[PDB]
Design a protein around this ligand. Structure first.
Ligand SMILES: C=C[C@]1(C)C[C@@H](OC(=O)CS[C@@H]2CC[C@@H](N)C[C@H]2O)[C@]2(C)[C@H](C)CC[C@]3(CCC(=O)[C@H]32)[C@@H](C)[C@@H]1O
Ligand SMILES: [K+]
Ligand SMILES: [K+]
Ligand SMILES: [K+]
Ligand SMILES: [Mg+2]
Ligand SMILES: [Mg+2]
Ligand SMILES: [Mg+2]
Ligand SMILES: [Mg+2]
Ligand SMILES: [Mg+2]
Ligand SMILES: [Mg+2]
Ligand SMILES: [Mg+2]
Ligand SMILES: [Mg+2]
Ligand SMILES: [Mg+2]
Ligand SMILES: [Mg+2]
Ligand SMILES: [Mg+2]
Ligand SMILES: [Mg+2]
Ligand SMILES: [Mg+2]
Ligand SMILES: [Mg+2]
Ligand SMILES: [Mg+2]
Ligand SMILES: [Mg+2]
Ligand SMILES: [Mg+2]
Ligand SMILES: [Mg+2]
Ligand SMILES: [Mg+2]
Ligand SMILES: [Mg+2]
Ligand SMILES: [Mg+2]
Ligand SMILES: [Mg+2]
Ligand SMILES: [Mg+2]
Ligand SMILES: [Mg+2]
Ligand SMILES: [Mg+2]
Ligand SMILES: [Mg+2]
Ligand SMILES: [Mg+2]
Ligand SMILES: [Mg+2]
Ligand SMILES: [Mg+2]
Ligand SMILES: [Mg+2]
Ligand SMILES: [Mg+2]
Ligand SMILES: [Mg+2]
Ligand code: NA
Ligand code: NA
Ligand SMILES: [Zn+2]
Lengths: 57, 35, 121, 123, 113, 204
RNA sequence: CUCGAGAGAUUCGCGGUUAAGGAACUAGGCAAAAUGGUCCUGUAACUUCGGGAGAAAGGACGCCUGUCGACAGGCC
RNA sequence: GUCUCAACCGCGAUCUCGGUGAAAUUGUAGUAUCGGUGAAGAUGCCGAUUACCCGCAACGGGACGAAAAGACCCCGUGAA
RNA sequence: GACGGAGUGGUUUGGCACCUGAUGUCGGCUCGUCACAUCCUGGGGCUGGAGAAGGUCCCAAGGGUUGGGCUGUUCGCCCAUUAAAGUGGCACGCGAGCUGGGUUCAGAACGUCGUGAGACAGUUCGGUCUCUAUCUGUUGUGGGCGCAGGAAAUUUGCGAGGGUCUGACACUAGUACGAGAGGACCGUGUUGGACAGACCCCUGGUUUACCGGUUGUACCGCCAGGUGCACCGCCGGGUAUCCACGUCUGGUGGAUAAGUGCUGAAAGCAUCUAAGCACGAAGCCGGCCUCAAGAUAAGAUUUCCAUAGGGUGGUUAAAGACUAUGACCUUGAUAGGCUGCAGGUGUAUGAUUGGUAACAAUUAAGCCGAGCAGUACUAAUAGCCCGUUU
């Protein structure tokens, strides 16, 4: 129920070994040339898989 | 009754050399096969 | 599916009318008794002026159950109630008539029940 | 365990879940495309495609069966009017889901679902 | 291919019987054995349930004998069934008649069709 | 010795003696000998068999060179069996008639996966107390896990919650009901581990 | 009703159903189940003559037709 | 369904991800096991034994675990 | 087996007062683990052992070893069984696991003692059981690196764990033995109970997917037809999945213990032992099942590369907490849809015809289809990263 001792700096840092921000899965858009997430519609151009999907004004 | 019979023969043993004892219980009409 | 504290109808003319199972014979933790099984009962109620008395301890054999019984030919049988027949110390029955149907399982246990029952299954 | 239990409860009670699917379907028939989350849009697909299939048998019984789901007379008017004619030859697969990104407030996966016969750029 | 359907065909047992639904009154001619003597024992009652798939259905038939209710479950494809004859064509509003277990005479009667 | 099979499903059949028997349908399909293992090279004698036809798109180049050597069509599943009698060589074909002289068989499979399960379902624990009579929140609890200051520890092998199922299981002495060489079908009395479509080893 | 989204392990909170048995549970029938309305019958010991008493135990109950809330016939 | 003897179902909690973010406790710790030894019941001593480095879920045997300068008992030329 | 004597142990009652700014206490529940001084099952010696049934001692801890009535009870008595209903240790095992009936707070009462305040070798009714698990421990499941180049598979097993129970009948045989009552060893067989594992064809349960009846009320402008809410409103059914009450399967040579002997001296005889040798237990080791090369002693085999092979991603699953694992990713049936079918429910909307009406018969039943088969309509883009590929 209660910690018998405070953890040292080493023990705390060893546990935090597995605390990593997950990197996005990025791809370049063949139309725009911009980065977009793989398997999503490019927010800049609106295209997806070579076809127009969201005609943006 | 008359559903089995006892058969014994003695074979020399490589571990020692003297005769051991081999025993079973086979049906009455099977001892001629064993011996 | 009869166990300790179950109440059964008494299905012969032995005088008793309702019985309470005390024990299922034949095993340390044998839980249930089916048709053809032997149990030990206490007589809970009787007809006025009968031979056996209320509160007597007796052996009995089950002849009907509400839980369905399986047969090797793929058929099942169940009854509307659970019933038994009282037996004497020598293994025979203490009555003359059987009232109601009995199961075919007893053809392998007791021929006296089967011979003098109105119907089998 | 959930072996072979093929529908998403969507974190709602049964009466709530049925009401949301019916409100969402009306929105898709009236507006040819709507923006929602991915888990909600995949559950709508199993719900709205059989309803769009009922417009291939134009009768009083089909309209009333459809109305018992939507309970919205403007959606029924649109579903058995212009929507019925556009999908008269397509053998299923009337809708399409395309992923878009993530929401600011809870990082929910987003997408859009639409009727295929109303998107000209993708034909 | 389909292998359950091949096996069911190879191991087909029994004979054709006339069609009946729940709520019908039928007689079952069942073959029993007692001391190497084979005889047919009739069992007549109302069908209260049919369940299963295809040629493998099971039906439950209930009768009242000497004031005690009796229920029997029969496999339709069993080789022990000699004949099924339909006595009456009943009239019910549902598939399973479990409610007949709680009705006595003059209240368990079923209208004819 | 034995072959590889695929679980199809269960049904019930009537025998000639007039008994209702539950049977399991297994497709003990054609198995090719893909590698012969010998004493002088491998340390033991066994046969490696291949069961399910595989597309080239699903076969890696190391496995492609493995089947091409044996000169057989690539397979999806591979297993070893020992103690045959007949000295089959590379590329031979075996089928259901192998069991046409078999009275009983053993079936090895992988059981259905239950996931993480508590002590009540995994080990049949009785539970703590009744549902009433002062029960607070230990209805499906394990109870005590050990003694006091001596031991002063939990022993190895203590029964606890954890993953249940999805593991290799053997069922022995299954009675063979019929062999159907036409469809590569085998019929056995009883049940076998695993879901429909799972891969089984049948030992003669 | 000033946090949401997924997912649908164990376990807990609040709820639902359950074969056969029916208090064998437990310190203890704790908790739950069961009873439950209106009208018409019928109500024991005992009693301070007021009670006990809603004792206990039973029956009818929907819709339609007509007739003088009731009666009869019919329907599900 | 109190039990034999449990099984299944629904939501809330639970688990994973995004946002915000405490507390009790804390001499320092790279904190394994067994028997012995010992202020007389050992993670830390002796002799052996076992053990690649680092997490997550789940349960409570030990840390004479936490909390509160034992109310029992005795003592004070104490108190009410 | 008297009168007496020598030891062993530390589970009783004591003796001592050595540890303790708190080392939770009786009984029960749950979960066990160890011993053997063995209750049953296995193997023996002796008998005041004819047989049957016993008595006593020796070896043996593999497995097993019931449910109730009374009592807070432990313990006991009783009822009915069973092959048997073992004895103990583990803080009289186990309250950061449960309970709180008993003991031991504050209320009240009886007997009894005291002038009284009050008190008890007593009794009786009532009376809050706290904590979000850091270390270690234990059950599961991953990430990194290693394994003397990198990979895809198949494996040997150094070892570890699991499993280990048992009844009743038939024949031999109403025989051996025994005036008689009674009544065998050895050996074949046939059927049970308990426990465990897997599974869902059967029986039975669930089945807030689904279908139907019905009450009250409000909406879709009205009627008709539907829907919301009332515990899933209530009631009757119910597929797949998950299950037990169901079904199937399982408990399979060597060296020994207590003992029995052969040959045989020391010690002319005797002697199972001193040299040798043949036996001999549910026990030991193998045999059965599962894990298992971080077995740093890191093993073996087949093949590929030096585009081999992967990761991230997507459609998903009988796989799953997250992971991991399986299938598929367009020269594709992975999922949904569509088209059919097994199946559930039980005869829809409307329209005729009957009836005065409530209602009913015809006509396709209608709805659903978590399962199955077919079919690219929808979604699965080889983009990016390590070392030609979905
Ligand atoms: C309060 C101490 C307790 C909780 C219990 C204690 O019980 C007693 O004190 C019985 S007297 C009782 C006390 C309460 C009074 N209001 C009335 C009076 O009747 C007990 C059983 C021992 C006898 C002493 C040691 C112990 C630790 C180990 C243990 O088993 C404990 C102490 C250290 C423990 O913390
Ligand atoms: K220890
Ligand atoms: K079902
Ligand atoms: K498809
Ligand atoms: Mg972390
Ligand atoms: Mg699973
Ligand atoms: Mg329980
Ligand atoms: Mg409580
Ligand atoms: Mg609770
Ligand atoms: Mg019940
Ligand atoms: Mg019932
Ligand atoms: Mg009791
Ligand atoms: Mg009790
Ligand atoms: Mg109450
Ligand atoms: Mg929830
Ligand atoms: Mg968070
Ligand atoms: Mg010590
Ligand atoms: Mg130590
Ligand atoms: Mg403390
Ligand atoms: Mg102090
Ligand atoms: Mg001691
Ligand atoms: Mg302290
Ligand atoms: Mg001994
Ligand atoms: Mg204790
Ligand atoms: Mg406590
Ligand atoms: Mg404790
Ligand atoms: Mg007082
Ligand atoms: Mg009170
Ligand atoms: Mg508590
Ligand atoms: Mg099924
Ligand atoms: Mg069923
Ligand atoms: Mg409203
Ligand atoms: Mg509701
Ligand atoms: Mg309201
Ligand atoms: Mg001599
Ligand atoms: Mg592609
Ligand atoms: Na006085
Ligand atoms: Na389907
Ligand atoms: Zn772009």
């Amino acid at each position: 129920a209660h910690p018998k001792r405070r953890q040292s700096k080493t023990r705390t840092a060893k546990r935090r070994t597995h605390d990593k921000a997950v990197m996005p899965t990025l791809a370049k858009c063949p139309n725009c040339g911009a980065w977009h997430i793989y398997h999503t519609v490019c927010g800049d151009c609106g295209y997806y898989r070579g076809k127009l999907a969201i005609e943006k004004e | 009754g008359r559903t089995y019979s006892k058969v014994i023969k003695m074979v020399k043993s490589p571990k020692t050399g003297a005769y051991t004892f081999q025993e079973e219980m086979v049906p009455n009409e099977a001892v001629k096969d064993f011996f | 599916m009869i166990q300790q504290e179950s109440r059964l109808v008494v299905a012969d003319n032995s005088g008793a009318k309702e019985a309470l199972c005390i024990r299922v014979l034949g095993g340390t933790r044998r839980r249930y008794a089916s048709v053809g099984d032997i149990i030990v009962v206490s007589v809970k109620s009787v007809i006025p002026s009968s031979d056996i008395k209320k509160g007597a301890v007796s052996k009995a054999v089950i002849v009907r159950t509400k839980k369905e019984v399986r047969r090797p030919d793929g058929s099942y049988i169940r009854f509307d109630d659970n019933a038994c027949v009282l037996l004497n110390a020598a293994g025979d029955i203490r009555g003359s008539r059987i009232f109601g149907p009995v199961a075919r399982e007893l053809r392998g246990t007791n021929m006296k029940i089967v011979s003098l029952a109105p119907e089998v299954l | 365990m959930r072996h072979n239990k093929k529908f998403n409860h969507l974190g709602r009670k049964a009466a709530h879940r049925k009401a949301m699917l019916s409100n969402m379907a009306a929105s898709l028939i009236l507006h040819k495309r709507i923006f929602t989350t991915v888990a909600k849009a995949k559950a709508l697909r199993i719900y709205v495609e059989p309803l769009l299939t009922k417009t291939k048998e134009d009768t009083t019984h089909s309209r009333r069966i459809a109305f018992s789901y939507l309970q919205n007379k403007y959606a029924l008017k649109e579903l058995f009017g212009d929507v019925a004619a556009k999908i008269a030859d397509r053998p299923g697969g009337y809708t399409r889901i395309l992923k878009t990104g993530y929401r600011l407030g809870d990082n929910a996966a987003m997408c859009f679902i639409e009727l295929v016969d109303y998107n000209e750029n993708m034909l | 291919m389909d292998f359950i359907k091949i096996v069911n065909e190879e191991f087909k047992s029994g004979k054709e019987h006339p069609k009946f639904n729940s709520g019908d009154t039928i007689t079952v001619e069942y073959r029993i054995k007692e001391g190497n003597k084979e005889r047919i024992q009739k069992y007549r009652g109302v069908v209260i349930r049919i369940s299963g798939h295809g040629d493998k259905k099971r039906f439950t038939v209930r009768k009242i004998s000497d004031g005690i209710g009796v229920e029997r479950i029969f496999p339709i494809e069993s080789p022990f069934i000699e004949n099924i004859t339909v006595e009456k064509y009943g009239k019910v509003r549902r598939a399973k008649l479990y409610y007949l277990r709680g009705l006595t005479g003059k209240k368990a009667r079923i209208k004819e069709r | 010795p034995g072959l590889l099979g695929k679980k199809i499903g269960m049904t019930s059949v009537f025998s000639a003696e007039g008994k209702n028997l539950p049977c399991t349908v297994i497709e003990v399909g054609p198995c090719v000998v893909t590698q012969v293992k010998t004493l002088e090279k491998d340390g033991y004698s066994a046969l490696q068999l291949g069961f399910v036809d595989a597309k080239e798109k699903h076969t890696t180049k190391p496995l492609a060179g493995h089947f091409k050597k044996a000169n057989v069509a690539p397979k999806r599943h591979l297993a070893e069996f020992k103690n045959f009698e007949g000295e089959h060589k590379l590329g031979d074909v075996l089928n259901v008639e192998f069991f046409s002289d078999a009275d009983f068989v053993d079936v090895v499979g992988t059981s259905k996966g239950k996931g993480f399960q508590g002590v009540v379902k995994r080990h049949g624990f009785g539970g703590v107390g009744q549902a009433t009579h002062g029960q607070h929140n230990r209805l499906r609890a394990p109870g005590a896990v050990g003694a006091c200051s001596y031991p002063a520890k939990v022993f190895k092998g203590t029964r606890m919650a954890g993953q249940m199922g999805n593991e290799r299981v053997t069922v022995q002495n299954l009675e063979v009901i019929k062999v159907m060489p036409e469809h590569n079908l085998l019929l056995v009395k009883g049940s076998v581990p695993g879901a429909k479509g799972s891969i089984l080893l049948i030992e003669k």
